[PDB]
Design a protein around this ligand. Structure first.
Ligand SMILES: Nc1nc(=O)c2ncn([C@@H]3O[C@H](CO)[C@@H](O)[C@H]3OP(=O)(O)OC[C@H]3O[C@@H](n4cnc5c(N)ncnc54)[C@H](O)[C@@H]3OP(=O)(O)O)c2[nH]1
Lengths: 191, 199
């Protein structure tokens, strides 16, 4: 391919046959890891924190879920900028960050294949704050008794990433109203 | 009322009223491991800094759980209660592994502090990974073989085997959880931890 690293896009779905799925972009080759907790963006070094958080990226059919390392900056990173390690090897492409304050930003950088990853097929992940005690399929319940009623009373696959104040990431997959899996990742959620 | 019972009997009653731990039902939320120590049959055992992915089938659901490894020179009988240093029950002994004539290893769940995945209506299968790509219930050397399987399944799909779960590993490393249904791929979790047990 002529496009080595290509950000996700609806019209780039043919890249799934030729490129690896990173969280937010396709890559022709396996990318390098972060070395000594530093990333290099536009010629400036940025220390990488010890914090991680769950990020996600829809590519038009699948959702890539990835535990990424958090990088706190005092400067905005333009989207799709290449990220290098201190050995001048490309680590990835800049994805969407968050502006903490007027002069504060936080970006999430995937560190190769070192951390949690989940490739969800044919599902557009929904992220929402947990409002009740129990989450099950695409519904929420106050107690087990309300849950048993729904199960006995009960289209398409779905994926929901739950959090409470960006904490305790909880990923639920469901199909036709039935629960498939309920994974408590014990990680923060980025955003 | 059995407040802390191992998987394998009367699941209908337990599943509506008890919390699902990896291998046993508990009426209450169980205590955590305090100061990296568990107590089994009156003896204190230091808990290592190692974890591994374990699983337990209760007869309809599979509980997947990252557990903490405890090395011991003494065998722990199945179902023996496990306590913390406050004499608070933390669980029941599950199956371990024997590393040497004098050395054993058990995996102990530390409450709900670590990774936990509840698989509904599925019996997990553990398999050593032998090809580069895992997809649905199959393995493929490359994406061209994968694309053939996808396209042929799109043309004709006779798989009505239902929902399945496969835990892949390479020499007990690189835990990878594949969920699938009727020849379709659902989710591919890279857990990065070792897989516990005689595998
Ligand atoms: N992207 C990625 N992130 C990780 O964190 C990671 N940890 C390990 N690995 C393995 O590295 C090998 C490559 O050296 C891969 O094979 C992979 O093992 P696996 O995790 O067993 O593989 C499933 C393949 O299968 C891919 N697919 C999934 N669906 C499709 C589809 N419809 N069409 C084409 N490919 C599909 C899926 O994206 C994927 O392959 P790619 O990421 O390279 O694209 C990782 N790969």
């Amino acid at each position: 391919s002529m496009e080595s690293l290509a950000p996700f896009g609806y019209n780039k779905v043919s890249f799934k046959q030729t490129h690896h799925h990173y969280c937010g972009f396709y890559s022709l080759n396996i990318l390098a890891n972060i070395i000594d907790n530093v990333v290099v963006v536009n010629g400036k070094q940025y220390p990488v924190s010890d914090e991680t958080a769950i990020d996600w990226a829809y590519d038009g059919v699948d959702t890539i879920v990835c535990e990424k390392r958090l990088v706190y900056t005092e400067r905005e990173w333009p989207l799709h900028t290449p990220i290098y390690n201190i050995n001048n090897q490309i680590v990835g492409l800049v994805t969407h960050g968050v502006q903490l304050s007027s002069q504060e930003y936080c970006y999430a950088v995937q560190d190769g294949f070192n951390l949690y990853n989940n490739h969800l097929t044919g599902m557009n992940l929904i992220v929402r704050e947990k409002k009740k005690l129990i989450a099950y399929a695409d519904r929420e319940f106050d107690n087990k008794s309300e849950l048993q009623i729904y199960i006995e009373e009960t289209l398409g696959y779905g994926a929901i990433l739950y959090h409470v104040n960006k904490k305790n990431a909880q990923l639920i997959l469901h199909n036709n109203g039935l629960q498939i899996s309920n994974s408590r990742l014990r990680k923060n959620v980025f955003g």
